[model samples]
Target: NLIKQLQERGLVAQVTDEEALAERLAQGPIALYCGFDPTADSLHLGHLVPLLCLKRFQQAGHKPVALVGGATGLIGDPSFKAAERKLNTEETVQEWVDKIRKQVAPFLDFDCGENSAIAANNYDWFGNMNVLTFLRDIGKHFSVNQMINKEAVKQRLNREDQGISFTEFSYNLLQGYDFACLNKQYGVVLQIGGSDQWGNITSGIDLTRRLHQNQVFGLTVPLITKADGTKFGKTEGGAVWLDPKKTSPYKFYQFWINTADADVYRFLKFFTFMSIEEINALEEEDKNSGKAPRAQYVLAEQVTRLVHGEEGLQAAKR
Candidate 1:
C-alpha cells in the first residue's frame, strides 16, 4: 500500500526483487534507512527525494534512520560523475556532518511515539576497524570482478581522461558496509537512494545476506527533472540548499512558487503530504477559475513550513 502511494507520487524507481520486498514490507513495521554522505555542508535539491522518503516512512508509523556517512564522506562515491570529487579533511567532513545533522532533525518528529526517528554516523562502526581488519573482514565478502562490473565502476573505468581512484572505486564497498552495519545494529531492513545508487544499494543487500543470512531490501527514488531537462533545486547560481542561511527562505519559497504549470500539481504530490483528493480538488479549481495554480503556493507553504517552521515560513511569505 505504501509502495503504491510512493508509485503514485512518482517516487519509486527500482526495488531489489519487487515481489520479495513488497511481501516483507506488507508484513509489518521495518526500519528503513537512507544515508547522506556528508560531502556537502548542506543537503541540496538532489537529496530531496531520499530525505522525503525517510519522512514518508516515519509518517506511515515505520522507524526511520537518518544515516550520515561520516566515514564514506571522506571517500566520495564515484557514481554518476565525470571525475573524482574534491576531498575534504576529516575535520571539515565532520563539521559538515554537524551542520547537516542540525538541518536534518527538524524535518521529522523525534517526539513521536514508537517510530521516533534517530540519526547515525557511520564512523562509529568504521572507526572501530583498521584498514587491515576492514580488508580481511568486510572486504572478504566482495570480489574485485563483482566490484568492477558495477555500472558506476564500469563507466568510470571506461572514461578516457579522469580515471577512478582506488579510494573512490572502493566507495561502494564502504557504503555496502554501512547498510550491513545498520542492519546489524539498528535492525534497518530497507535502504533507499537515488536511481544512480541502485547498484550500490543492491550490493549492500548482498553483503547483509552474506554477513547475517538475512535478505534486506532496497528502493530508489526518481531524480526530479524540470521541463527543459534541467534538474530540480538547481539554479543559475547553484543548488537550493535546505539550510535557510545557505539558501534564503524567500529563495526557497520562490523555487516552488515558480514551478511550471505542467509540474506544479505533480510536485505537490511529491513534496506536500496533502491527500490525493485534496490535490485533485486543487487542480479542479485551477481549471475552472482560470487563475494561476493556487496549488503551487500551497505546495510552497507546506514544504517551507516543514523545512523552516512557522516563523521561517512567515518570513519567506513576507
Candidate 2:
C-alpha cells in the first residue's frame, strides 16, 4: 500500500486515522490532494516533499490533485507562523499562480488514463463567491470557540505583540472549503501537507465531514532538517528555487552534492525513488571502500534530472 511505502521512506509524520486510512487504500485507488500557495514566484526545495509525495501516489495508481492556492494565497496561510505574512496583490498572486501551475505540471503524468493527475485552483471556486454566501454557508460551520483552540493560530492568539488578523485567522475556512469542494468534484478522500499543517489538515477533515458527511483523512510529511541541525533548504545564496533562472541546474546539483555524510543516505530515502536496497548497498559500499562517498553524486544526478531534464543534468555536471 502507498501508506506502507510512505512509512518505510520516513515520509509520514502523522495520519489522521492510520488504521482506517490503510483499510481505505487497500480497497482501491482514491483521489488525494496537496496544496501549494503562490507566496513566491517559484517553489523552493522545502516544497518538494509534498509535491513528490503526490507523484508517489500517482505511481501507485491513485489520483493526484495538485491544488494551487490562488485564492488562499491572497489572504496567506497563518498556520504555525511566527508573524503575519505580507499579503500579495491579486495581480502578482495571479502571475505567480500561472508560474507555479507550470512548475508543478511536470511532476505528474496528465495523460496516463484512469488515474491521470488533475490541477485545481481555490480561486476558481471562491473568486465569485459572495461574502454573505461564504459567511452564512461556510462560516456557519466553523465555531470561533473551537478555532481559538487550534494549535496553528493559538500561538498568535496568545501573543502579546502579534495578534492574527481576521483574514489570516479565517484561512482555515478557505483551506477547509478547498477540501470539501475537491471532495464534491473529485471524490478526494485524503489531504497531505507538512507536519506543521496538522491543525489545518484536521480542519479540512472536519469540514468535509460536516459538509458532505464523508469521512476523509489527513497526512503530513515531516519538515526537513539537516544533520547539522541547520535548516535543510536555506543556503548562503538564499533558498534553492525550482526555477532555473533563480537557481540554475548546476547550483541545484551542487546543493545535493554538498549534503553532509551523516544526512546523505537518509536524504536519498527522502528525495530519490531508488529502492531502499540500492541505497543501503551504496551506503555499505561507501563505508567499506573508505574513500569519497559516491552517494552524493548519485543523489545529485537523480534529483537534478528530476528537477531539470537529462540535458540539464549533463550541463550541470560540466
Model number with the top TM-score:
2
Q: What is the lDDT of residue 177 in candidate 1?
A: 87
Most accurate candidate by lDDT: 2
Question: How many pairs of residues in model 2 come into backbone collision?
Answer: 0
TM-score for all models, in order of appearance: 0.96, 0.98
For candidate 2, the per-residue lDDT at 237 reads 91
lDDT of 1 by residue, 1-318 (tens): 888789887889887777887788889888998888898899986787688889898888889998888888999989878888989999999999999887788776788898988899888988778899889898899899878888877878866876888899888888898899889988999999889898889899999999999989999998777867877889976889988888988899999888888888888877778887788899998988957769788988988887888887989878
Instruction: Provide the overall lDDT of each model, using Cα atoms, as 2-decimal numbers.
Output: 0.86, 0.92
Clashes of each: 0, 0
- In the range 1-318, model 2's lDDT, one tens digit per residue, is 778878887899999999999999999999999999999999988898899999888888899999999999999899989898999999999999999999999988899999999999999989999999999899999999999999989899987977899999999999999999999999999999899888888999999999899999999999978998988789989999989999989999999999999989988988888988899899999998968999999999888989998977988978
**Model 1, 57: alpha-carbon shift in Å?**
1.0
